[PDB]
């Protein structure tokens, strides 16, 4: 009756993988109101972050943690478990706590040192495995097995929960104090710059204390021929159905700051100020991850064993892309109704949590020898995290601050991925 | 043999970082008021420095951290492994000196915040492991040469004083190349010179990280009638530590407040902002070169064969009247600029060939070891309180800049080293 602790003590690493890669996305919008806003003109929205520099403060965190995964999994061996362990974990509370710093007051010196401090951020969320280290080692015992890892990695969603309300939070206690009129009136005083200056600091430091409590939680407790023939058809399809994942799963939650203001949820862009935006994207993207994340990662738990491993991603895939299309096509109808849009999203969130995304990952562990059961999940998590790369530095720029055509091609490209993922889940027999 | 002083100066390592971290802080003080505290017009007579109170906290909160720290990692921080507090407080000193080189915002306010908070913590990992408790202290090989390791280990303090000067010379001097602008005379806004020198004073104090990093991986790979009968040494100890950390703070911390009163720069509103650091960091180097450290060198020569009571007591003598003598020629150090170097650099000098050597060592050799540990615990604690009046008492003096303010604390200086001339002789050499 008390191991849903033990899951919680399992998935920290999880919960903080979530709250230091997806609390970006709520203060994208005020790193470039304020920074990267000329003071003068006031021609277009509120000036925020160009392509390229959108592209990499997402980006950069994804480019360490693949690095991390990669070095700390092939020199990870003369070391571990204390070593890589203690090393990752406090990574990722001290240049945590370093991105909510500054090395001046240039925009091109504020960003620089946060793009630095996010690279070592990805490094931390990298070469540290998060269930792989401990509970794929065993996955013994035939009773909740599958069960019990979605149910550990049910954190990412409680990860994204805690993302949202933290900003959410933050957002209202500073917005309280000061009220400023909106940007289609006092176009300078819309940044409230010496308030709003700390606001994105508080948010991204927040996020050094559940590395501090993985710490303190972990720290107290006790390729030839032959795989060639035998499963490199399998290899490979278990490699692309993550990598058909992530550019589906971080392309949803990374671009989460242009979807709603496009239709609805939000009051765009140049009609409210820099905190109360940020406030209304918080509240929409903790909205949605409530309805969507959360019950999708229960369901698997529910019903992971009863249904099995093919039919689920299966469906999954499938419904991605039907979902999708109807997100796209329809675009015009969606941006009329403010909540049939919401809806959607709502169960492309859900049927993403209860389908392939806790899924993918269990494929390299119920599958290929000991021999080599490490590399093939190494290189399948490093498939996930291109996939995760592609994703940021890729689908990202086909939406950002673009127009309607934009987003709905970025619409149909991600249906026609996830399409294309549910063919190439027929690859993964499970008996 | 080189292995000799290599091991010297791997043990010694500690104090160099030591007093890097505290003394970094020294040159970069008038940067910080010419950047931060000069607005955008309402030039006067002088460029904007530190408001009194803001220097007070900046130069002395280190050293409450430090008294803070030798508390903590003191009194109940000695039951947890020796290794433990010493990686803890060896890897709190680098992420507070990288820390110190980032602010949390653009105001004043918030640098000032953030300098202060990170200074302290650092003071705070300064303090406690205290680099010579845990170290070869205990093998006391008998009374002859038991010293003179000891005291050649204190040379990296001087080193690291050496190497703050250097430090700071070194990055003012790049970044003055590729940035020239006209002096505060000629220009009140350029002459703040200030996406330069918002990133030297940064660089300058983030440096500190790598002594202690350094220290970091050398030192991993390790593996009621005695109140009465020992009273008056214990008096005599503390009080005398109290007034050397005194004078050699106050000496220290307050050069920048010296030396534009009475020549070896350039005045203060005639120069940008990085030649002034970069002058004043020359002069502090030069100080420390051919002042402090062979005065290291010197005690370290002479410590057994003249002992430690007769140079502590002639240290504090020539302490007494070579500050008084600077006291009152103050007019005369105004006409000749080369005497004044020399008078200051033998003040540093028999400052090093004194008690710098002897007070750290004055808790040795008296109070058993039944109260060995909390004797020298109080001993230090009363060296960083002089330390922290020095901070915020002298150097107050000093910055009003007054004329008379210097007079007046050059001469309750000389008072205080001949108090501890006259309290030199409570203890006893044996």
């Not at 979605?150 to 949202?164: C, H, K, N, R, Y």
């Not at 469906?315 to 849009?341: C, E, N, P």
Request: aromatic share 14%; glycine share 10%.
């Amino acid at each position: 009756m008390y191991h849903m602790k033990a899951i919680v003590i399992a998935g920290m690493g999880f919960f903080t993988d979530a709250y230091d890669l997806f609390c970006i996305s709520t203060v994208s919008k005020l790193l470039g109101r304020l920074y990267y806003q000329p003071d003068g003109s006031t021609d277009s929205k509120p000036g925020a972050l160009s392509k390229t520099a959108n592209n990499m403060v997402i980006g950069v965190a994804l480019v360490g943690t693949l690095m991390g995964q990669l070095v700390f999994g092939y020199f990870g061996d003369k070391l571990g478990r204390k070593r890589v362990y203690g090393v990752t974990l406090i990574l990722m509370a001290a240049c945590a706590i370093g991105s909510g710093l500054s090395f001046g007051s240039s925009r091109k010196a504020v960003i620089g040192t946060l793009c630095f401090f996010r690279f070592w951020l990805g490094f931390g969320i990298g070469g540290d495995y998060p269930l792989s280290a401990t509970i794929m080692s065993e996955y013994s015992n035939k009773k909740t097995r599958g069960a019990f890892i979605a149910a550990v990695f049910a954190m990412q969603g409680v990860g994204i929960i805690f993302a949202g309300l933290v900003s959410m939070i933050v957002s209202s206690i500073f917005l309280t104090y000061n009220k400023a009129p909106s940007y289609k009136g006092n176009h300078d005083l819309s940044r409230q710059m010496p308030a709003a200056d700390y606001v994105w600091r508080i948010v991204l430091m927040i996020g050094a204390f559940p590395a501090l409590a993985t710490f303190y939680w972990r720290m107290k407790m006790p390729l030839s021929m032959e795989f060639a023939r035998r499963h490199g058809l399998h290899l490979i399809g278990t490699t692309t159905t993550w990598f058909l994942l992530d550019i589906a799963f971080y392309s949803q939650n990374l671009t989460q700051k242009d979807i709603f203001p496009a239709m609805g949820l939000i009051s765009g862009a140049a009609e409210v100020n820099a905190l109360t935006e940020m406030f209304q994207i918080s509240k929409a993207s903790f909205l949605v991850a409530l309805l969507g994340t959360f019950p999708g990662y229960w369901v698997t738990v529910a019903l992971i064993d009863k249904m099995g491993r093919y039919m689920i991603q299966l469906i999954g895939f499938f419904m991605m892309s039907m979902f999708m299309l109807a997100m796209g096509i329809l675009y015009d109808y969606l941006k009329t109704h403010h909540f049939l849009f919401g809806l959607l999203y709502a169960l492309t969130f859900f049927f993403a949590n209860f389908g392939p995304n806790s899924t993918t990952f269990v494929l390299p562990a119920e599958l290929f020898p000991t021999r080599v059961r490490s590399t093939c999940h190494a290189i399948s998590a490093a498939a996930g995290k291109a996939g995760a790369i592609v994703a940021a530095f890729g689908i990202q720029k086909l939406t950002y601050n673009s127009q309607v055509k934009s987003i709905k091609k970025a619409l149909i490209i991600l249906s026609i991925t996830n399409m294309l993922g549910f063919f190439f889940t027929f690859l993964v027999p499970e008996t």
